[PDB]
Amino acid sequence: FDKYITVFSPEGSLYQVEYAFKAVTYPGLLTVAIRCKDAVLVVTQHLIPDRLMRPDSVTALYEVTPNIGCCMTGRAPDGRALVQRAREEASDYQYRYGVEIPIAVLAKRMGDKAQVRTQQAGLRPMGVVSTFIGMDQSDQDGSLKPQIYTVDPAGWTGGHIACAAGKKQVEAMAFLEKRQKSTELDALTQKEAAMIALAALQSAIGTAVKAKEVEVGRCTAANPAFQRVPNSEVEEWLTAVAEA
Amino acid sequence: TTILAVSYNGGVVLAADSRTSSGTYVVNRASNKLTKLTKKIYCCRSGSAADTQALAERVSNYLGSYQTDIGAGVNVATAANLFQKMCYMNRWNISAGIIVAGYDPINGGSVYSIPSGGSCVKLDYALGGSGSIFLYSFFDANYKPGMSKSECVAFCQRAVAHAYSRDGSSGGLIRTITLDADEPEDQTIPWNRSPYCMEKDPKYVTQATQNQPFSSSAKITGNRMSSTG
Numbered sequence: 001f002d003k004y005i006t007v008f009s010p011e012g013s014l015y016q017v018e019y020a021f022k023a024v025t026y027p028g029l030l031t032v033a034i035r036c037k038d039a040v041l042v043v044t045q046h047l048i049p050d051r052l053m054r055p056d057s058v059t060a061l062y063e064v065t066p067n068i069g070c071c072m073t074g075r076a077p078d079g080r081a082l083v084q085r086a087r088e089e090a091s092d093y094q095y096r097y098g099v100e101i102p103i104a105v106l107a108k109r110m111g112d113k114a115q116v117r118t119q120q121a122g123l124r125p126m127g128v129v130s131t132f133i134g135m136d137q138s139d140q141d142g143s144l145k146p147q148i149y150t151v152d153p154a155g156w157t158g159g160h161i162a163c164a165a166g167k168k169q170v171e172a173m174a175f176l177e178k179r180q181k182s183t184e185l186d187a188l189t190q191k192e193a194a195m196i197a198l199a200a201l202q203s204a205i206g207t208a209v210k211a212k213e214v215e216v217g218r219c220t221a222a223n224p225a226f227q228r229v230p231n232s233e234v235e236e237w238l239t240a241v242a243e244a
Numbered sequence: 245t246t247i248l249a250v251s252y253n254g255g256v257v258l259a260a261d262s263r264t265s266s267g268t269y270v271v272n273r274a275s276n277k278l279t280k281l282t283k284k285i286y287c288c289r290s291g292s293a294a295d296t297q298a299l300a301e302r303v304s305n306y307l308g309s310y311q312t313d314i315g316a317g318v319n320v321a322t323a324a325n326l327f328q329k330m331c332y333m334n335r336w337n338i339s340a341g342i343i344v345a346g347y348d349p350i351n352g353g354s355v356y357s358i359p360s361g362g363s364c365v366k367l368d369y370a371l372g373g374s375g376s377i378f379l380y381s382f383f384d385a386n387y388k389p390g391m392s393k394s395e396c397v398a399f400c401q402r403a404v405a406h407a408y409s410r411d412g413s414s415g416g417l418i419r420t421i422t423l424d425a426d427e428p429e430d431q432t433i434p435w436n437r438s439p440y441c442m443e444k445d446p447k448y449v450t451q452a453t454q455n456q457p458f459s460s461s462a463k464i465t466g467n468r469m470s471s472t473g
Contacts, residue, residue, distance in 0.1 A: 063315070064312070065308075065312065066312070084313075087309060087313060091305060094305055094308060095301070095302070098301070
């Protein structure tokens with residue numbers, strides 16, 4: 001009875017929301033984002049076991065607005081649906097305030113949307129971890145400074161220097177944390193940062209990945225629009241990970 | 245207000261005066277009447293500044309949402325059919341005379357007049373606003389389709405000038421913008437260097453012989469310009 005609606009158990013936990021965090025683990029897809037000095041990556045697993053499935057079509061990472069790229073992890077279709085809420089949100093903002101939604105807000109508005117589903121009974125929490133990435137103009141000098149923001153099905157918004165979400169998110173965070181003690185991680189070039197992300201993807205699942213079995217998102221201070229990275233440029237990072 | 249799109253082979257040129265009058269006083273001297281909907285699809289705006297700006301933003305917003313979700317460019321058609329629906333729904337409340345021009349890769353250089361009523365007429369070239377009425381004859385005479393990008397700009401400027409030189413409502417700068425495969429080229433011809441104006445035209449140097457001295461002869465000479473003469 002505690003378990004099947006969004007109400008507190010005797011120990012003060014909304015069981016439905018612990019059970020949505022399990023729905024992020026279930027598909028066996030792991031994403032890793034990483035902020036560098038001038039850019040953000042989001043690396044996602046992109047596993048198509050069917051030879052007949054068109055690779056092109058199945059994406060984790062959607063554009064939300066030109067400057068903010070998502071990367072949903074969990075029930076794909078719940079992801080798909082949040083992205084639509086996030087676009088609706090970012091268009092609503094663009095109209096009412098006449099500027100692009102700042103990523104920090106977008107994340108925090110999606111935080112409050114996912115909270116509402118943990119409060120009103122009979123809505124299912126979206127079984128997914130939004131990983132919004134984008135440049136955000138610091139109002140001190142004018143510089144574009146890179147950002148990652150995870151929403152999770154609890155409604156917990158947070159910023160991230162780097163982050164993982166999905167199957168092995170514990171072991172992929174363990175790898176990034178151990179590699180935060182060596183380096184600074186915000187004094188890194190886009191290349192170095194990628195090699196750490198794609199090494200965490202590799203360390204976590206336990207296998208060497210192809211440039212086809214991942215898709216990678218990107219925003220830079222130079223090119224603040226959310227780009228998918230071409231499979232050519234990802235292969236120059238997976239060759240550079242296998243070396244060092 | 246004077247606005248006009250024309251299509252050349254690759255793309256389009258929009259062009260505009262830059263004057264918004266409250267009738268007889270010039271409120272703003274340097275208004276941008278060319279209003280970006282997408283990267284390559286500008287609309288020109290004649291009539292109530294309020295109403296065209298509100299519609300240009302309302303559409304620029306739907307095209308942004310659209311452009312995101314389809315994960316591709318917007319067809320100019322899409323911009324004009326959105327703009328038609330919004331000009332048509334409110335056709336009684338508003339006073340809006342729009343020209344959506346643009347480039348998409350599918351059709352190339354498209355131009356749609358959306359006048360008051362919320363008609364929507366795909367054309368080779370559209371004229372809008374008070375100062376349109378002057379150009380219609382000027383186009384019928386001097387326009388010659390299949391112009392190069394360079395000529396179409398130099399032409400539209402010449403046009404917007406001939407209009408704003410006769411119309412009171414129209415005047416100031418001649419903003420153009422070229423929308424094609426390449427990156428949008430806006431240029432802003434300031435009045436002091438406009439291609440045509442009545443003031444500098446040698447036709448109108450010699451004054452009308454209205455004043456005319458007290459003479460002993462029906463022979464019209466010139467105006468009286470000194471009290472001594």
